[PDB]
Amino acid sequence: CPAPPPGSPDIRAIGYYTDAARSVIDPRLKTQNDAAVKPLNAFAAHVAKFADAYAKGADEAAGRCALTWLDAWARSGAMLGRMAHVNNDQSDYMRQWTHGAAAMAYLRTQALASEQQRTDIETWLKRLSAANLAYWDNPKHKRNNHYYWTGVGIMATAVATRDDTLLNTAQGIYRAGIDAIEPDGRLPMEMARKRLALHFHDYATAPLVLMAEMARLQGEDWYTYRQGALERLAARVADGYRDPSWFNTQSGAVQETATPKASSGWVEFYRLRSPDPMRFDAMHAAGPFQDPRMGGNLTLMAQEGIVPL
Ligand SMILES: [Cl-]
């Protein structure tokens, strides 16, 4: 259990796309952002590592280590200060993703928490939920996949604290994504991303599936809302990794060649829920899948449950 990075109240991230469709990356800006947000990405990667180690069994120490890191950031007010804006809103996106990583790690390890840790961490996760929700009050912030990802931290906080109000907030975010799917299966804000259209349909599916999976922890089946619409979207993604011709024509660009990885691991859960599960076998074979922003090892969580016994 090494020492945590500092948890500053403040964030200063850098946007890295060159074009109107935010589909081509400037590698100099990407390197600059990577260095600027390194504490946030190292925090998320470590707490997910500790949670995965706890889930193997016979390692309560790894679970307690995650809680030590979360408590330290809670007591320093991490991410609750200034979101600095340089060339876009990357600082706010980073707060959305890192809140998700922290809240997932707490949900997986909270059985081991002390009294003081519970109060410290749950208070911090609720303040982050309120701050992230307030960003979307401005109607000029377009509610694409960043909005769905904001729902990850709100929903994990809701389940862990048993807050029916935050639970209703998250259900609204999930339903807004489901309602955006068109009859032909597209999400229009993601189809606008040219050679990354397929990439961002995959990336928008991931948080919607994860909130639905978290809802099973309170016995609810969110896949009955507009039943079948999420399957049309997921089927287009699986089809697209086989043959991208539909994404090519509807986006106006040839899709960037890529293998499924990281957050593509939503398929590990969803193949257990679909009426046509073997359609997702080709994507499954690219695994195992790990993503700290989704709680860690998705291949193992789909078999063993999100929260270890
Ligand atoms: Cl600045």
Structure tokens at 55: 């889930």
Q: Angle at the Cα of 166 (from 107 to 84), degrees rounded to 5?
A: 85
- For residue 86, the CA-to-ligand 1 centroid distance in Å is 6
- For residue 87, the CA-to-ligand 1 centroid distance in Å is 10
Q: What whole-number distance in Å separates Cα of residue 132 and Cα of residue 150?
A: 7
Q: How many CB atoms lie within 10 A of CB 137?
A: 7
Q: What are phi and psi of 83, to 5 degrees?
A: -95, 95
- For residue 13, the CA-to-ligand 1 centroid distance in Å is 9
- For residue 85, the CA-to-ligand 1 centroid distance in Å is 6
Q: What whole-number distance in Å separates Cα of residue 100 and Cα of residue 210?
A: 11
123 near 158, Cβ under 8 Å? no
On the 0-12 / 13-18 / 19+ scale of CB atoms within 10 A, 232 is middle
To 10 degrees, the CA torsion angle through 122, 125, 130, 136? Answer: -150
Measured in whole angstroms, how far is the alpha carbon of residue 193 from the centre of its chain? Answer: 19
CA distances in angstroms from 35 to 65, 81, 84, 185, listed in the order given: 25, 20, 15, 37
Structure tokens at 171: 């259900």
- For residue 48, the CA-to-ligand 1 centroid distance in Å is 30
Angstrom resolution of this structure: 1.7
Q: What whole-number distance in Å separates Cα of residue 22 and Cα of residue 274?
A: 32
- For residue 122, the CA-to-ligand 1 centroid distance in Å is 30
201 near 236, Cβ under 8 Å? yes
- For residue 26, the CA-to-ligand 1 centroid distance in Å is 20
Q: Residue 296: beta bridge partners?
A: 291
The pocket of ion ligand 1, defined by CB under 5 A, consists of: 84
- For residue 81, the CA-to-ligand 1 centroid distance in Å is 13
Q: What whole-number distance in Å separates Cα of residue 174 and Cα of residue 165?
A: 15
Structure tokens at 194: 């040219």
Q: Angle at the Cα of 166 (from 165 to 169), degrees rounded to 5?
A: 95
Break sites following residues in the chain (C–N > 2.5 A): none
CA distances in angstroms from 160 to 156, 214, 215, listed in the order given: 6, 10, 12
Structure tokens at 78: 């991490």
- For residue 82, the CA-to-ligand 1 centroid distance in Å is 9
Q: What whole-number distance in Å separates Cα of residue 227 and Cα of residue 33?
A: 40
298 near 268, Cβ under 8 Å? yes
Structure tokens at 80: 């609750």
Nearest CA-CA partner of 203 in 19, 22, 2:
22
Nearest CA-CA partner of 32 in 88, 107, 102, 100:
88
First-residue to last-residue Cα distance in the chain: 22
Structure tokens at 138: 């401005």
- For residue 22, the CA-to-ligand 1 centroid distance in Å is 22
- For residue 132, the CA-to-ligand 1 centroid distance in Å is 20
- For the chain, the farthest-separated pair of C-alpha atoms sits apart, in whole angstroms, at 56
The label of the residue with tokens 């909130």 reads: 211
